[PDB]
């Protein structure tokens, strides 16, 4: 957790001054601002040592955790509805879920085969979608005109689940 | 706009069949699903030619238009408030705006100097932030515990506005 070699010198220096005596983890941390200033440049690599921040290296960042979202210029909502409602394309997985779940209803299209971001924007753009979300596992999710936000965080698109549990 | 060389053959073929006679741009487009099927693989590169989708190359995608958003594991809201409320760090620009504007109040921290995404996550993580948004101009925006969503789309962080008008 704590990087002892980098932090042992400076981290102890604050402790002698008696800073960083307050745990943010439960309750208010009055000293938190003072503790950060005493650490200075080492706060990023040493806030764990004083308990002010989560341990540095414990989780292996799944690729799905990142997604990149852009809003398409000049959306064409009528097209998006027309291609969604009817017998959908096999390449397309269509999910409608209640709007504001991610935080009437929000409908998104999940492309099957994994694709590059630039293709994903183009494919959504050809669909008239208001927005697209690109998971860093490379799953592509077009966002319908109705949807308030960026749609579901779930990597629900078939034939590219790499980056998900089991 | 239209890529004549790729699309002239196939696009005309649908027109002879009398598909793609309906404009999505105003009103319902009944034929839109049929038009896409007739184009098939060329829909991405040729939907513009039939008017079903926006012209291919007209806008120079600003870097700020993309942003990548991840939700931090194990946020520490007390720390985020403590370092925000008081006399803020010069490196940090603190913006509070009403919550749900982007779609009580949402507070975000805009790092000054432009930084890599991995540093941006770490810097937000040391701050206890629930989430971070990284603009592809490389501006970094930590997201406060209060904020419902991913915070402001604006690239409001000082000393890295590259990717914005004028």
Author numbering:
A (entry chain A), B (entry chain A): 25 to 127, 165 to 227
Study authors write:
Twisted gastrulation (TWSG1) is an evolutionarily conserved secreted glycoprotein which controls signaling by Bone Morphogenetic Proteins (BMPs). TWSG1 binds BMPs and their antagonist Chordin to control BMP signaling during embryonic development, kidney regeneration and cancer. TWSG1 is composed of two distinct, disulfide-rich domains. The TWSG1 N-terminal domain occupies the BMP type 1 receptor binding site on BMPs, whereas the C-terminal domain binds to a Chordin family member.
